[PDB]
Design a protein around this ligand. Structure first.
Ligand SMILES: Nc1nc2c(ncn2[C@H]2C[C@H](O)[C@@H](COP(=O)(O)CP(=O)(O)OP(=O)(O)O)O2)c(=O)[nH]1
Ligand SMILES: [Mg+2]
Ligand SMILES: [Mg+2]
Ligand code: NA
Ligand code: NA
Length: 326
DNA sequence: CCGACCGCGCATCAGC
DNA sequence: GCTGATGCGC
DNA sequence: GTCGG
């Protein structure tokens, strides 16, 4: 990682605009620029060299100049002194508290972790679990645990039916040696884009993962999506593993390829692929890649039998999971 | 200039 | 109760 | 904040 200083600074700036300014376009601008800079294999030596990058414009470039000259931006160091902004930033780091609730709590005089662990009657279920596992959720998962976690889920799924197919995606499918969480894609033949043949098809999986105590908390559940907590088992007098965010996404089997494409990401990569789908005359979601007419008409689902079928439509040579860590 | 800047599932609230 | 907008997350 | 047209 060649320009950690610059990319860090942009991530700070991005977080501030999102959490404190509630300026979601400025946030996505910083996030893009942080991404392209994070991928560029020269060590940036001036703001001018960095303005040659796309998504880096003038205001970023002058920030990049001030930061190599001094190791800092005073904008950020002011943001770091201001008690109210700092407190907001900090509360967003609890899962389920975003910019709106972070500022509400700070206006209510709730600004630190103690205050939360005392006004829980003001937290909803998600925020409650979030603070409960606050330290754990800040920790990364070494890939070796991801593999450990992978065996449990995939084998517990064949127990409910051997026609379930599960594919870990997220940063694990991109090849990271550490992940924020585990993201799991769920396929069954009896749930095409049409027949809801067997209901509770995703509840089946979840409940079985709860029997064997792999899943231990729930942030949200639905026919298509489960956000919860999981924990690896440990040996005698072996200390416990940290509790981990787990996401499970059930998707029609005949739309699998747009499922993995969505779920391996990254999130920025999907924004750039989907924005480029739009320039080429298509729209892409988790389910389909559709044509557009000059009239805002989301056209008719187009046939894909490979991930690369998606790329060819928008005229992209295939990028391997390792290369979409944008 | 300035319009666009990804697309969706779930929880919760307001309003009726 | 539903519907529609909003927060928050993937 | 940055970009295409
Ligand atoms: N289109 C789109 N896809 C997204 C978005 N956010 C996530 N995804 C897709 C792509 C994303 O890869 C996947 C899971 O998102 P996470 O688990 O939150 C982040 P991951 O990439 O796994 O990295 P980690 O921090 O966990 O190490 O859903 C989004 O905003 N938009
Ligand atoms: Mg992930
Ligand atoms: Mg996830
Ligand atoms: Na530029
Ligand atoms: Na949060």
């Amino acid at each position: 990682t060649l320009n950690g200083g610059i990319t860090d600074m942009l991530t700070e700036l991005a977080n501030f605009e999102k959490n404190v300014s509630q300026a979601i376009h400025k946030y996505n601008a910083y996030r893009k620029a942080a991404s392209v800079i994070a991928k560029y294999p020269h060590k940036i030596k001036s703001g001018a060299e960095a303005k040659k990058l796309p998504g880096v414009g003038t205001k970023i470039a002058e920030k990049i100049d001030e930061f190599l000259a001094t190791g800092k931006l005073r904008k950020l160091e002011k943001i770091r002194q201001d008690d109210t902004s700092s407190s907001i930033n900090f509360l967003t780091r609890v899962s389920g508290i975003g910019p709106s609730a972070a500022r509400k709590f700070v206006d209510e005089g709730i600004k630190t972790l103690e205050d939360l662990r005392k006004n829980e009657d003001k937290l909803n279920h998600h925020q409650r679990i979030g603070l409960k596992y606050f330290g754990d959720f800040e920790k990364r998962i070494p890939r070796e645990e991801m593999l450990q976690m992978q065996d449990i889920v995939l084998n517990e799924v064949k127990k409910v039916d051997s026609e379930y197919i599960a594919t870990v995606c997220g940063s694990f499918r991109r090849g990271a040696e550490s992940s924020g969480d585990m993201d799991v894609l769920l396929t069954h033949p009896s749930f095409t884009s049409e027949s809801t043949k067997q209901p509770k098809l995703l509840h089946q999986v979840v409940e079985q993962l709860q029997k064997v105590h792999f899943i231990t908390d729930t942030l949200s559940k639905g026919e298509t999506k489960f956000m919860g907590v999981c924990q690896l088992p440990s040996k005698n007098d072996e200390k416990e593993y940290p509790h981990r965010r787990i996401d499970i996404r059930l998707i029609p089997k005949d739309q699998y390829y747009c499922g993995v494409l969505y779920f391996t990401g990254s999130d920025i990569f999907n924004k750039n692929m989907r924005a480029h789908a739009l320039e080429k005359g298509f729209t892409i979601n988790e389910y389909t890649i559709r044509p557009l007419g000059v009239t805002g008409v989301a056209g008719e689902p187009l046939p894909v039998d490979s991930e690369k079928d998606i790329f060819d439509y928008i005229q992209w040579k295939y990028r391997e999971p390792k290369d979409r860590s944008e």
